[PDB]
Design a protein around this nucleic acid. Structure first.
Ligand code: MG
Lengths: 306, 317, 318, 305
RNA sequence: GUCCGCAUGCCGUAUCGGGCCUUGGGUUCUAACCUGUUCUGUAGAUUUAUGCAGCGGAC
RNA sequence: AGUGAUAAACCGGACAGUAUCAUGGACCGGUUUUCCCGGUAAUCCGUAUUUACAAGGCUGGUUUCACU
DNA sequence: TACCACCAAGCCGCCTTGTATTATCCCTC
DNA sequence: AGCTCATCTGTAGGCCCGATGGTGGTA
DNA sequence: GGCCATAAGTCAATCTACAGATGAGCT
DNA sequence: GAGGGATAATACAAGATACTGTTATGGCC
């Protein structure tokens, strides 16, 4: 006795499809609102559905309320990468693509694949990643305006210089807001110190790594976390968080250039005859693994191991 | 019930059994009559009485082993290679640049539980073989036709000699097809029904029989249209993603190829065709769009007329 | 007597290649600095070169000072579209040494084609376009931060809301700076009112149009200004077989093309003469965006027409 | 001197004359033996007895009119169409029509002053035609060979019957080519020089001679390498594919089996070059050495390499 | 010999940007008609090849 | 930077192909959403040959070596 | 003790002209 | 003075150029 | 003097949902 | 009454798997 539910999410609506143990489908549309989420739970209890595994494609942040609602209702929620769903639909031989089809396709995804259960991240983890991605957003905007000074007309410059001062201030404000967040929590304070002990990783990179690694050891292996960033070869897969991947490139250079263990790594690969960026790609992968390793070890970085 | 996947190749087979408990027995074999008997014996050795084998439709290299296991007394499924690739990509994020392993096909078989494959009737195999040979030589004839336009004088003897040969051969095959369909009383009758449709003649009917077959495999005419890849492909999500509808093309190309000129003959110089054309033309559709739609219609009517078992009735349209 | 010079510009260094009437070359590289620009002029006068036609590629802000320098030093300066430059290099050979267009190639471009002479913009024209493109940059960033509010985390919202305020303030400030520019000059003040008289054009669109049309009427026909914005269809007819389909060329300033879209949408919807234009097109098998693309072209063409006429918009003419 | 630009079509012509004073004169003609005789007369109508005519290398529809005007007494230039298009994009940014292109070729002619086109010798034209036909039948013979691999048994009589026909025809042309060569004393000797190179045999010698021709129409051997599209820009590939493809198998036979070829392979292998990069390099070399050997007029000498 | 450890070797070309240039074609002929699908964006998801080598532990 | 010489050295990833596979979204009656059952030669959603085919064109960069 | 300067840097053919298929209807020997 | 509401499949080319972060080494 | 093997054989993340602009008539 | 010729359509994009031949020469018989 286990139902398999599939929810295709939109901004406004929720298309739901319940696959019963007998094999027949029940479907109903709902509003993607706090009210319409309570309507969904009531409609499941209406049909006497107590145990169910619910599958839902990671679709912006429109699925996040209902995923947490159904988790709290006491169901098994799985939030799948939508690339998998796309591939599954093709494997299921489906020609047309509609919302009703997708909700059914997700129900069958749930039954066949039996995906891993989804856990809502800790409030601190959610806060930290929010600040970190906001910080990258301002940096990008600061870089836009900093490029413009190069070829700016003299009537444009007062505006550009003014904007740069604002952006530089706001950037510092967040950096403190981040520091306050990690310093308050005893665990994050300690874990961040461990990351900064790695030569090549500083204030900025340590925050990014904590945002994606989290409080607890959610990864079982170092190579898993490296793969999660899209750093493991397939050429690099690039099948992982781009914000995590981009944050490691400049750490990789200062490591391979101005550290002992970095130059040691650089020279070894240089000997075998690797190009500059190939070595950097490799060092990005290594920094990721070492970062996860240092945290699980729970003791400062030790160069002797490398 | 065990689940087996076979990664077929020209020279080697690669086999992966999945036991009910969940352990993998694996062995490679030669893709030969000997190595097919080795497989059956190896399966029978490990006390594998009932199993569901899944094979990719790679080509003619997988056909003997599929027949061997069918005879041995197993459930053989022969899957569209695109489904296998898509399945591998649904199993992981980074399986794009990877082969579909025998293990993957066993998992495919367990999860999907695909339909059982049936070997075609020897007569159906012969017909489809002749029909695609006929298409092959038409293409070659067309090549040489195009060459006559801009030929040099020293080349023309060679091109003209080839054209004679190709026309003689095309004519020989057309008789060999006619003799095949006439000899069998079922095909003779079913062909006559297809030709009753206005827009469908001697060549198209042979192509339709080659893919419809003796038995009525398709439950609904809709499905035979989908089989040819002639149905539109909807692409809709939320209130933003709005992909324009287009011909799916996810079906037999040999079929889809054969229906275009019929569609053009239908919509142009036929009562029921013009009627269809005008209605869509009024609704504001392009010329080639109307043909694409008529192609789907002909396929759908072709199966409909056979399913009825009576000649084409214009009143129904 | 007339020499043909080509200058291949870079950030730091100039690369000059004189072509003599006889056919021999003179080559000398210079620094791309105020000193090196005066050094260039002296060097040309050194070799008794008073009459010459200089050809430079339009690569941005590194080639502007030297183009000014030579124009003032009494020479015919042509500033060519780099797309023309590359196409010329490919017409000279099939397997060219490099894909780059060197100074020698530019000297040759100048000789064979005798391109049109480049006139330096008026300080006010150059200032107005500077402010207008700055305004469009801040509008883009404002739109970025607007989109973010939709899906923002609550810890992020204070930062986004704060930025939006700054951007909105800056945009108001900059719009006033534009208004004060045009209202000071009696020429620009008059021309702006003539533009705004057109239904579907207001304060923002008028400034963009003035920025690209300028003080004087450089275009002979109004169709040419529509082409300058990249709003004219692109035909691809060849022989009998090769017949494609007409789409917008988009071969022109994006700043103009982006500025006219919402005006066109206002015109066809609310204004009488626009609605009239929409309907006649809509009668034929013409889709919504196709009508907008058409109205965009029309608005540009009317915008120029009105300024050339020198009298406010008159609905009777449409 | 007048600058005339002919835009060619299957049926019609679009002539555009540009006078020294700088005024256009347009007049259409039919692309026929009659309409070519009209053109000659109409030019002499406006007292044009000395002009440079520019026309795109467009199919074979411009071959008669080019031969006509060459015989009439004009400087005919037949330009690569890729150049023409590039020139059109250098003049403007917009629109592509027949009326534009006819006028455009007059401007091309004036500014560029392109090299004069010379009609091939009948034998050069015949040999090329046979060699081109021979490739067409080889490509068809391969199709039917591939088809035997996976053929059904009812198809197999048809495929085998076709192969026999194709093999008979290939053998026939190879003789027709050999007869053409052995008759002409020049081609007979020229081909013998080509075959003397280790790595070039019956097949390749005919292909090379088809594109080199009777006269030494290239100044240097490195020019002929460029004409095949074998020179690095990665290979440009800006040349005859028929000439290019013919050298790949000779290149393998050279680098693998011949003494001078192995030497070449080894030297690049020492520097650390990939398999196909060495083949790419040897293709260029065979082309260069082929032309060199003909210039010399002396059988291949290994010493030089 | 098997299984399990690994911040190990082998494999690895990051992510974002900025500025500037653009003087149609046909017609009943240039503020007319025919021909015309703007310019930019935003957010989220991603758990090993441990595949093969080493090195270590347990039985 | 020209001109002449070059069968040398450096720079070099050719072309053409073949076979095979493919059971719509839905609509119309029941049930009283879908699912499921029955029906579909009708209506709405369709730019064929998941690459249609043919012919033609293509006069190197540099380093040595001479002469300006 | 706060401030400055490096650290890495790949992409791979273009053009111009043409035409066939099949089945049904209409015209001529 | 303020608010709504008009469009919905995707497809121009070229040339000049810069930032990121975290060390070890300066003033 | 007629047959037969055989030399060569790189590629550049994937998805899923979403939004703004400007100017004129209306409120 | 039967056989041959002409016309209908025109912007293009977007699925997978398995596989082969070319030529010329030094090896064989
Ligand atoms: Mg969805």
């Amino acid at each position: 006795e286990l139902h398999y539910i599939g929810i295709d999410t939109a901004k406004e609506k929720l298309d739901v499809d319940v696959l019963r143990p007998d094999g027949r489908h029940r479907t109903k549309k709902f509003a993607n609102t706090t009210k319409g989420h309570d309507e969904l739970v009531s409609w499941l209890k209406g049909h006497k559905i107590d145990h169910a595994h619910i599958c839902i494609e990671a679709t912006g942040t429109y699925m996040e309320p209902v995923a947490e609602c159904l988790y709290d209702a006491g169901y098994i929620v799985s939030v799948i990468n939508p690339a998998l769903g796309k591939a599954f639909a093709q494997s299921e031989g489906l020609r047309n693509k509609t919302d009703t089809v997708d909700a059914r396709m997700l129900a069958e995804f749930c039954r066949q694949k039996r995906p891993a259960a989804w856990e809502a991240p800790h409030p601190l983890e959610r806060a930290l990643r929010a600040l970190v991605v906001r910080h990258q957003a301002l940096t990008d905007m600061h870089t836009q305006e900093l490029n413009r000074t190069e070829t700016a007309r003299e009537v444009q410059r007062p505006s550009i210089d003014a904007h740069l001062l604002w952006l530089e201030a706001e950037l510092k404000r967040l950096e403190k807001q981040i520091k306050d967040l990690t310093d308050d929590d005893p665990d994050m304070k300690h874990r961040r110190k461990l990351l900064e002990s790695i030569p090549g990783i500083g204030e900025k990179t340590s925050a990014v790594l904590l945002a994606y690694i989290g409080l607890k050891d959610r990864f079982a292996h170092a190579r898993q976390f490296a793969a999660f960033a899209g750093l493991t070869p397939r050429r690099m897969s690039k099948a992982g968080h781009v914000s995590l991947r981009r944050a490691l490139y400049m750490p990789a250079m200062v490591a391979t250039s101005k550290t002992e263990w970095g130059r040691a790594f650089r020279d070894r690969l240089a000997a075998n005859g690797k190009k500059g960026k190939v070595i950097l790609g490799a060092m990005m992968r290594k920094l990721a693994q070492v970062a996860y390793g240092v945290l699980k070890s729970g003791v400062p970085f030790d160069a002797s191991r490398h």
